[PDB]
Every structure is written in structure tokens, then in C-alpha cells.
Design a protein around this ligand. Structure first.
Ligand SMILES: Nc1ncnc2c1ncn2[C@@H]1O[C@H](C(=O)NC2CCNCC2)[C@@H](O)[C@H]1O
Lengths: 239, 198
């Protein structure tokens, strides 16, 4: 009976009052299907992405936007990325778009790279522990991760506490959502970090301190009989 | 004039120039995801309703993109996006690829609005689902604190949507109920026989 009025009165965001914010095994098979973590330091503006092969089933794209801070990438820079050159003909994208003009320019990008948006995933940030763009009408308290598709029990909400100032990490829950979709095993996280490296994922970004990426080693994880695995099924028996 | 007013009408055919200018427009339109075609939505005479102010536009599915298109076509820039998190009476979320726990409302600006109380509310609404199709009443309070006392207009409103300071348009309202003298006068002239066709 009006958490908006309440927020005006007390500074407690309406999302602070959402409550309660058989599940496993599938997780366990995901973990058994997962490739070893692979990672590569690369300055993505100077780097020819087409060196990243084979083509990916899932791309998670996390460009460091200026709004995160209160080398940054503008939507001009992001839109000029050649994402379609490394996406498989049937493949998925998850694009962190922030909360400002990225909600529009990010949709332009998806279309430019050949995707249509199927989901809008909103990371809602509570302020239980501590109860402004000039164009803003309202206090901005969430970020959007757009999900795109190209070719032929989770909710579209992530709720966590607003991270400390200068912390630009996105909630790890996005990885669970993506992996529960069972979309394939060639998974690329662009602009990931040392702190985001993860089994079943290839992480590429400027701040990585070490690399282990080898295109021929990477490809051999998806050689026959493993070419079409969802990431949610048992490994194919050998010898 | 302060008390609720409304016009039962086909929003495609009403001459909305008789209504004047509004600080806020809001619409929960019937996107074709009784509906309106994309072209009919594009052709709605939104541009004449405001010089400087805000548009609130509910979207779902592919109208997340089409509503952005209408927005820009009508002369607005999208400067915020309200999210309504749907709960039950105990404040738990009402749980293709993902289940949907929210609905979106695009926020557009036209011109250079002056004297609005920007930043008082935040862009998340947590409110109980009432009937199917209804939007939460909280949005009227947010809009009132944002632009207190100004004239507002709602398109595709239903009887439960009528509110003080709002003129509500929709084909499920009961008749015509106008009290603003300027509007009454311009309505009589435009519609001397009270009939809104063509
Ligand atoms: N051409 C028209 N002129 C005036 N009103 C119209 C016209 N077409 C339809 N309506 C009315 O708009 C309302 C509506 O459809 N709401 C839903 C929009 C999507 N989310 C759920 C609510 C209904 O009351 C409907 O009868």
C-alpha cells in the first residue's frame, strides 16, 4: 500500500521489501559438461575478434560503461564491435546495458549483429544497508541485461544489494540464468576479469593478468562427438 | 479542473486538439503482440498533446521495441524506464525462455519541461496484482509528486483509471464527463451533436 510513497518518506527502495528473493543435479550435469576455464588478455579495441574461434553459442558482453563510475567504452565503440563475425548461426547474446541510453543503443547493437531480443533481465538493487543523470526523471536503481537470439524455473529478475561505490561487478546469478538455459558449451564472456573467470567459459578482456587460451586446444573441447551438446547432459562415453 | 474527467471514444478517431496541452501523457495501449495495428499506433496524434512534458508508455513483448519507435516518432526521447515488480498480498513475486516477474513502462520527455520534481521517486514499483490488465495505482502518486497540480491525460484508460487532474480517454468509459470550461467549449464546437466518428 505504496512503497513508492514509503521510499519518498524514508529512503528505503520498494525493492527492499520483496520477500523470499529440487533445483540441483541439473547444476551438477552443467558442472560435468563444463570445459576447463579458458581466458585471454586482449585489448579488445585493438584486437581482431575473429582470432577467437570456434563460433560461440553464447556471448556475454560486459563493456565498461562510463555510468558505472561515479578505459571506459562508449556505445559508439561497442556498436562498432564485429560481434556477428564470431557468433554461431544459432546463438545467444547477453548484453549488460546499464540504465541510461544503453537501453536503446543496446537494442540497436543487438539488431546490428543479427539478433532479436527475447528477454529483458533486470538487476534490481536494494539499499537495505544505506537507506543522477541530468536527463533522469527518477532515481535509477537497476540495470538491464538484454538477451538476444539469432537463428532458429528462472525469472527475469535479479535482486541484490547495491554494491559499494567503485564496484562494477555484475551479479554472478547472471551466469546461473545463462547456464540453466542449456544453450551450448562454447561460451564467451567479453570484458570479463580475473574475478569472473569460470568453468565452462572463455573470458576475454583487457585487465586479465594471465592467459591460457589456445584456439586449437579450445576447439578440441567441441570436437566430435561433443559438437552439439547442450551443456546440461552427460558426457559421451569414451575408450 | 481538479476533479476526474473522461471521454468514452475511439482514440483513433477523436480530434484530440480540443483537449489542450498536458504536463504528462500516460498510455497502456492495446499493442498487437481489441487491439490496434502498429500503423494505427504510429498514427495516433500524440504530438499535439504536449509542448514540454513527459510520456509514460506501458510496453510488453515486441512492444518494448515498437513502443520505443512510437515514442521517437511522436517526438519524445526515452529518458527512464520504470519497472513494476508484481507481488501477491504477502510481497512475494508472481513467478518464453524465462518467467516474467515484471512489466515495463517507458518514460519519454518532449521539449524542456521546467519545474518538475525529478528524482523524488525511484524507477522500481513493488505492488500487488489486482485484476488482470490493471496497472498499479502507485504510478499516479509518482506522477503527482513529479508534476503536482498540472493537467494530465490518460489514453486507453478504464473506469478505475479516472483520477483528479486527469482526463481519461477510452472506449470502456461511461459516456462523456467534462468539467474544464475550456475543454467543454471546444468540445461543443467540434462535436455539436456529441457524436465522435470518422
Ligand atoms: N480504439 C480504442 N479506443 C479507445 N479505447 C480502446 C480502443 N481499443 C481498445 N481500447 C480499450 O483500451 C483498453 C485496453 O485494451 N487495455 C489493455 C492494453 C494492454 N494491457 C492490458 C490492458 C480496453 O479498455 C480497450 O477496450
Amino acid at each position: 500500500n505504496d512503497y513508492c510513497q514509503h521510499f519518498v518518506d524514508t529512503g528505503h527502495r520498494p525493492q527492499n521489501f520483496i520477500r523470499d528473493v529440487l533445483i540441483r543435479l541439473k547444476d551438477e550435469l552443467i558442472a560435468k559438461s563444463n570445459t576447463p576455464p579458458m581466458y585471454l588478455q586482449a585489448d579488445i579495441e585493438a584486437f581482431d575478434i575473429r582470432e577467437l574461434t570456434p563460433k560461440f553459442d553464447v556471448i556475454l558482453l560486459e563493456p565498461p560503461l562510463e555510468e558505472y563510475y561515479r578505459k571506459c567504452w562508449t556505445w559508439d565503440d561497442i556498436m562498432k564491435l564485429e560481434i556477428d563475425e564470431i557468433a554461431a548461426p544459432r546463438s545467444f547474446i547477453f548484453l549488460w546495458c546499464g540504465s541510461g541510453e544503453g537501453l536503446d543503443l543496446g537494442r540497436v547493437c543487438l539488431r546490428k549483429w543479427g539478433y532479436r531480443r527475447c528477454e529483458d533481465i533486470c538487476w534490481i538493487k536494494t539499499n537495505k544497508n544505506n537507506p543522477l543523470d541530468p536527463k533522469a526523471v527518477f532515481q535509477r536503481t537497476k540495470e538491464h541485461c538484454l538477451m538476444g537470439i539469432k537463428g532458429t524455473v528462472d525469472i527475469d529478475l535479479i535482486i541484490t544489494e547495491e554494491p559499494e561505490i567503485g564496484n562494477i561487478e555484475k551479479p554472478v546469478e547472471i551466469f546461473h540464468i545463462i547456464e540453466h538455459f542449456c544453450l551450448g558449451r562454447r561460451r564467451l564472456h567479453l570484458f570479463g576479469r580475473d574475478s569472473t573467470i569460470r568453468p565452462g567459459w572463455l573470458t576475454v578482456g583487457p585487465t586479465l593478468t594471465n592467459s591460457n587460451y589456445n584456439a586449437e586446444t579450445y576447439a578440441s573441447y567441441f570436437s566430435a562427438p561433443n559438437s552439439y551438446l547442450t551443456g546440461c547432459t552427460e558426457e559421451i562415453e569414451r575408450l | 479542473l481538479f476533479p476526474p474527467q473522461w471521454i468514452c471514444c475511439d482514440i483513433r478517431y477523436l480530434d484530440v486538439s480540443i483537449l489542450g496541452k498536458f504536463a504528462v501523457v500516460m498510455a497502456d495501449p492495446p499493442w498487437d503482440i481489441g487491439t490496434l495495428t502498429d500503423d494505427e499506433m504510429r498514427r495516433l496524434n500524440i504530438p499535439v498533446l504536449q509542448d514540454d512534458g513527459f510520456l509514460f508508455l506501458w510496453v510488453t513483448g515486441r512492444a518494448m521495441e515498437l513502443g520505443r519507435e512510437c515514442l521517437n516518432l511522436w517526438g519524445y526521447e526515452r529518458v527512464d524506464e520504470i519497472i513494476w515488480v508484481k507481488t501477491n498480498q504477502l510481497q512475494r513475486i508472481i513467478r518464453h525462455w524465462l518467467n516474467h516477474g515484471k512489466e515495463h513502462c517507458l518514460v519519454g520527455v518532449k521539449g524542456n519541461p521546467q519545474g518538475f520534481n525529478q528524482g523524488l521517486d525511484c524507477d522500481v514499483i513493488v505492488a500487488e496484482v489486482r485484476s488482470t490488465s490493471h496497472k498499479p495505482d502507485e504510478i499516479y502518486g509518482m506522477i503527482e509528486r513529479l508534476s503536482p497540480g498540472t493537467r494530465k491525460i490518460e489514453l486507453f484508460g478504464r473506469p478505475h483509471n479516472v483520477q483528479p487532474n486527469w482526463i481519461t480517454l477510452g472506449n470502456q468509459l461511461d459516456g462523456i464527463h467534462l468539467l474544464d470550461p475550456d475543454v467543454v467549449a471546444r468540445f461543443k464546437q467540434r462535436y455539436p451533436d456529441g457524436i465522435i466518428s470518422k
